[PDB]
Amino acid sequence: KTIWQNYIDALFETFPQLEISEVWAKWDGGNVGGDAKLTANIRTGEHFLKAREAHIVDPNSDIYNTILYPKTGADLPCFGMDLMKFSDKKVIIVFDFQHPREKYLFSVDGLPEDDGKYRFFEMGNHFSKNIFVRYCKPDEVDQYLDTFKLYLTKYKEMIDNNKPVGEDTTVYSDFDTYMTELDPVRGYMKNKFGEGRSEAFVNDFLFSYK
Ligand SMILES: C=CC1=C(C)/C(=C/c2[nH]c(/C=C3N=C(/C=C4\NC(=O)C(C)=C4C=C)C(C)=C\3CCC(=O)O)c(CCC(=O)O)c2C)NC1=O
């Protein structure tokens, strides 16, 4: 199992409509069975274009990367999460409302802020004033679970109060173009699963509305 199960459960507790509509990849790779496992899922449901759910695990790594893309028409942000356990004393937890409009600073008043000193992501470009990043230990991940449920409640609120119905995937063009520029997914998958698979995972699954 995953250290992440309590995040994963809270996610689909808040959004019970997100049913798997395509299992994009179940892949084995890494060291030889294969010791690296990818589950790539796409989920649909009321008020969403998609939720794309990547989950990679090997003996050392445990990575859950999931973006909720809502239907367009209501200027709504995505909700993105990168739950990354690299070693057994190194985890990084990332979650934010990620707005499709470039250069623009989105926020939700009441929520942790941020500043925003965090190095790998740029506040105000597809990351909000309330971007949540922490570094911690595997055994202490659930300390931030309630904060997580607070972001989910707020995001649920804004979906429910706007109820978008548009399907204009080009709204997310700039966003997914930007996110494809992030490292290291491309190379991590390259090594672990091969070039064809890394290319497809990134361009056809993770960030496919470029
Ligand atoms: C989805 C698959 C996925 C994989 C396979 C992955 C692997 C991964 N991400 C890392 C760091 C990191 N990865 C990210 C973020 C990302 N990096 C990305 O490739 C993407 C798409 C994001 C975010 C949406 C960040 C912010 C770090 C910083 C680590 C640090 O604190 O130094 C590292 C440590 C080594 C390094 O920084 O080069 C690995 C192995 N991260 C992932 O999200």
Swiss-Prot record:
Keyword Oxidoreductase part of the UniProt annotation: yes
InterPro entries for this protein: Ferredoxin-dep_bilin_Rdtase
A single BP term in Gene Ontology: phytochromobilin biosynthetic process
EC number: 1.3.7.6
Cystine residue pairs: none
Enzyme class: oxidoreductase
Catalytic activity: (3Z)-phycoerythrobilin + 2 oxidized 2[4Fe-4S]-[ferredoxin] = biliverdin IXalpha + 2 reduced 2[4Fe-4S]-[ferredoxin] + 4 H(+)
Keyword hit for Oxidoreductase: yes
Highest rank taxon of the organism: Viruses
Keywords: Oxidoreductase
Single GO molecular function: cobalt ion binding
Cited Pfam families: Fe_bilin_red
Record-stated family: Belongs to the HY2 family.
Task performed by this protein: Plays a role in phycoerythrobilin biosynthesis, the red pigment chromophore photosynthetically active biliproteins of the host cyanobacteria. Uses a four-electron reduction to carry out the reactions catalyzed by two enzymes (EC 1.3.7.2 and EC 1.3.7.3) in host.
PANTHER family xrefs: PHYTOCHROMOBILIN:FERREDOXIN OXIDOREDUCTASE, CHLOROPLASTIC
Protein name (record): Phycoerythrobilin synthase
Organism: Prochlorococcus phage P-SSM2
Gene: pebS
